[PDB]
């Protein structure tokens, strides 16, 4: 099965490797270091798990990632940016990207009080559009003509962030009993 956890420096080589496999936009290892050592609570990864290039440990290997930062160019209120997002093709269409993205959105607010978040996404990329526009409810801020190296336009997307809206308990059901934390799991 697929596990979902925070990112650490020990994932960035495999994050880079997933990026190189899944996207035409690629960065050098220093850029990933710059991310994980600047916002070490913002990025998350998806791995396989075995219980009792992308290989981190025996059995565990990275199938997805969400690379996240805060805007550090000014002068606006604190905002975030989704730098990159991939999920190896064999593990797509399962809700991995949603889980990564939802965690990262909550992180950006909870940790860095980001009042909104931006990203760039190709026009022709149907899967990516559905995720941001449909599943996650992002507004199209703009069109960016000839953004990518191959010449393709981009949608500049944006989402406003409020802490209680973004809590991971809110999206537990696709279509309602909770855990109150107070005892007990023996009832």
């Amino acid at each position: 099965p697929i596990n979902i956890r925070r990112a650490t420096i020990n994932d960035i080589i495999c994050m880079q490797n997933a990026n190189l496999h899944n996207l035409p936009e690629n960065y050098m290892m220093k850029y990933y270091m710059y991310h994980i050592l600047s916002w070490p609570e913002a990025s998350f990864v998806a791995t396989t798990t075995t219980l009792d290039p992308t290989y981190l440990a025996p059995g565990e290997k990275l199938v997805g990632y969400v690379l996240v930062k805060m805007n550090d160019d000014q002068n606006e209120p604190p905002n975030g940016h989704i730098t990159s997002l991939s999920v190896m093709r064999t593990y797509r269409r399962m809700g991995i990207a949603e889980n990564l993205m939802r965690q990262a959105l909550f992180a950006l607010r909870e940790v860095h009080q980001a009042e909104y978040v931006s990203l760039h996404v190709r026009q022709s990329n149907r899967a990516a559009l559905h995720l941001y526009r449909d599943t996650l409810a992002f507004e199209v801020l703009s069109i960016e003509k000839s953004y990518y190296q191959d010449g393709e336009d981009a949608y500049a997307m944006k989402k406003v962030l409020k802490l209680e809206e973004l809590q991971i308990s809110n999206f537990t059901h696709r279509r309602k009993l909770e855990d109150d934390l107070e005892s007990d799991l023996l009832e």
């Binding site: 035409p24 936009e25 990159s84 760039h120 190709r122 990518y148 190296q149 981009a154």
Partner: peptide, 6 residues
């Protein structure tokens, strides 16, 4: 996907 071109 952020583009790092210049």
């Amino acid at each position: 996907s952020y583009s790092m071109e210049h």
